Write a structure and sequence with these properties.
The structure is cut from a larger assembly and holds chains A (48 residues) and B (169 residues). By secondary structure, chain A is mainly alpha-helical. Chain A has two helices and no strands. Chain B has 169 residues and is of the alpha+beta class. The chains are: A mainly alpha (48), B alpha+beta (169). At the A-B interface, helix 1 of A face loops of B. Chain A: It comes from Saccharomyces cerevisiae (strain ATCC 204508 / S288c) (Baker's yeast). Chain A: Belongs to the Mediator complex subunit 22 family. Chain A: It is found in: Nucleus.
């Protein structure tokens, strides 16, 4: 009983450790913005 | 049919000790009515012979101390077989007999006397009688193992496991 249970539990822990290693260890326009800011600043100037 | 082992069998005879009392003189007389005293032993035959005649280290110490013990040899040397003889005595409460069987091998070529072979152990403690240590040891060990099994199964029931920690309580 003790040996079977211990061996199976050890194997399961080993599998989880492998999966954890798998997850962790594996290392891997501008012009439109111009008129956008121009309209924003002129709108604020008018509204201020 | 369930039989209590004779090794643990203990006889008490309050009437006999009340009437006669405990003494080395009648210790064999006390033993006579017990179940352990076989009726086929030559001691009983000697007893009926005496009755019919009337109608018509410490071993050497107890050897030389009593004359009835002498008469026991000179009446027992003639009859070979299962016989009851005293082992040792310390007064006024402790007596033990020696349970041996005799085969008087008078054949040619044997310079030794009659062969004496043990058969059983008997201890007279007070008014009580007691009659293998291997069995005692194995019984104690097996009961210990049973208790250990109970404790370990209870402890394993108490055990709780989680993958992220191991086993805890």
């Amino acid at each position: 009983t003790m040996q079977l249970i211990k061996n199976v539990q050890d194997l399961l822990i080993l599998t989880r450790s492998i999966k954890e290693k798998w997850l962790l260890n594996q290392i891997p326009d501008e012009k439109q913005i111009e008129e956008l800011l121009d309209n924003c600043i002129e709108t604020f100037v008018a509204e201020k | 049919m369930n039989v209590t082992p004779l090794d643990e069998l203990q006889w008490k005879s309050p009437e006999w000790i009340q009437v006669f009392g405990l003494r080395t003189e009648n210790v064999l007389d006390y033993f006579a009515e017990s179940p352990f005293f076989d009726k086929t032993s030559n001691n009983q035959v000697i007893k009926m012979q005496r009755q019919f005649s009337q109608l018509n280290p410490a071993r050497r110490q107890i050897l030389f101390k009593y004359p009835m013990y002498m008469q026991l040899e000179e009446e027992l040397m003639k009859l070979d077989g299962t016989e009851y003889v005293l082992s040792s005595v310390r007064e006024p409460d402790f007596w033990v007999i020696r349970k041996q069987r005799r085969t008087n091998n008078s054949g040619v070529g044997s310079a030794k006397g009659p062969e004496i072979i043990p058969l059983q152990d008997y201890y007279i403690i007070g008014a009580n009688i007691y009659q293998t240590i291997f069995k005692i040891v194995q019984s104690r060990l097996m009961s210990t193992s049973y208790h250990l099994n109970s404790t370990l199964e209870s402890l394993y029931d108490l055990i709780e496991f989680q993958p992220s920690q191991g086993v805890h309580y």
